[PDB]
Inverse folding.
């Protein structure tokens, strides 16, 4: 669809080298074990990241743009909920969410 195609283009931009400096922590699920975030899955009950969004998009699991945006917004919401406010990953999430919300708002 026209809307889902636009979302795919947003997702491809978020995964592009343009934004790599701050998008890379969202490229794949938080590895709470390697990172030793022993409380991560107690605090975050529905983990989300960009590779999962991409898997669902490629498999055409999102019926509409709102479902796609719900997943992306959960990824960011998880990041703000879990981390200390001054963590570098929070500053990175702020920049990538700016990019995402600005593109999403201009969906034809
Ligand atoms: C108080 C300590 O807080 C944290 O370390 N927080 C977070 C850390 C990282 C993070 C760092 C380094 C690396 C190498 C990775 N890679 S991976 C395979 O997990 O995605 C991720 N992502 N992250 C995301 C999203 N949301 N929070 C965090």
């Amino acid at each position: 669809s026209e809307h889902l195609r636009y979302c795919d283009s947003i997702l491809r931009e978020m995964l592009s080298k343009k934004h790599a400096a701050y998008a890379w922590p969202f490229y794949k699920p938080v590895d709470a074990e390697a990172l030793e975030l022993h409380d991560y899955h107690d605090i975050i009950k529905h983990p989300m990241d960009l590779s999962t969004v991409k898997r669902k998009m490629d498999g055409r699991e999102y019926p509409d743009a709102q479902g796609f945006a719900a997943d992306v917004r959960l990824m960011f919401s998880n990041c703000y909920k879990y981390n200390p406010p001054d963590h570098e990953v929070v500053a990175m999430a702020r920049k990538l969410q700016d990019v995402f919300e600005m593109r999403f708002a201009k969906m034809p």
